[PDB]
Amino acid sequence: NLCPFGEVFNATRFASVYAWNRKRISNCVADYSVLYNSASFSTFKCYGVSPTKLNDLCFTNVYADSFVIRGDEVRQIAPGQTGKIADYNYKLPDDFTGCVIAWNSNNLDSKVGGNYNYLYRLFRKSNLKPFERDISTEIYQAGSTPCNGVEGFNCYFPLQSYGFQPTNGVGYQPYRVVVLSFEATVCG
């Protein structure tokens, strides 16, 4: 059978970056050339192997991670990067061996007056391990006083809301990202 990229890339709604959705892909044949010969991606870079030469290759399992971030933040989706997304939302390992795919989704994810469904983790005590997924909504203690589940000065809700409006600058507009990690049941 063919691998279910259709339900990942053409999905109706994507997840918030802090709760990035992961799909495991196994026991199928995957044509990667139909993805790279679409030309409808603003970013599609591979770390580890060329796309045209990974269609000639097999892997035990293939993971597909998807989320929505800012255009200015699609840099941080790469090995060895720093920033609010790479540090507190979605980290790739230094020895990453997959492909990062992103495209502009302003027409779908931004509405007049602001779209606020998509969130990101702004406050965190320490950096994420690679492929860690944090969903805790514990109030963040930014001072010397216990916060105690109630917000206020130095007591902040860790997840902040994106403000996607269609008038935003390109880099500030929503972008959908798909991260294909390779680690034998998937071939081409």
Partner: antibody, heavy 116, light 108 residues
Amino acid sequence: VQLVESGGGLIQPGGSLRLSCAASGIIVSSNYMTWVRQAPGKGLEWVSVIYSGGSTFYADSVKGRFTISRDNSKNTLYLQMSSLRAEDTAVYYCARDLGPYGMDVWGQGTTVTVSS
Amino acid sequence: DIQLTQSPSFLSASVGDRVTITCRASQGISSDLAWYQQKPGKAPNLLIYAASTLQSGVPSRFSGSGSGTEFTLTISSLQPEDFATYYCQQLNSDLYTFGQGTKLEIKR
């Protein structure tokens, strides 16, 4: 809850200086901490930040010369200034960045003069 | 980077007047704008974040409004201590872009 700044004076052009930001009520170890400078009449310029995770980002006019550090024990924020030039002669501030909520807590400033 | 241009660099008015300071963005930062007030010999003070939200403690005569590219600060009834310099600032910016600044003076 305040931010007290110290450690700045006359430095030769080319030398090094270290500013210090002693926090109170705020833990520099768990916030975004900011350094801005301000030359007379030339307004506010951002310098660098240290995240609550260690990540340090800089302004391309300070990259290679300024280094941010942090002491959890002494709850102090530092800014190491090196290869100094005359263009750095300004008042240096440490504030706290709250992202979309602004920069609410500011220090008092330390004047740093760099001259022959 | 976006470029914030702050409209009246110099502005003069009298006590009890209403003034409006404008900050224009190059490309559209939605509502991520903050206003500051710097009195002579003091550090800046946060007045407004999220375009229009009043920081806790700021008097009610201050109010922000804007969304997209054009924003404004309004002081309802200008007071003797309001004569200072005001800075607008992009929020969630990688380079912490401030504006040139607006100085407020006494009319004559």
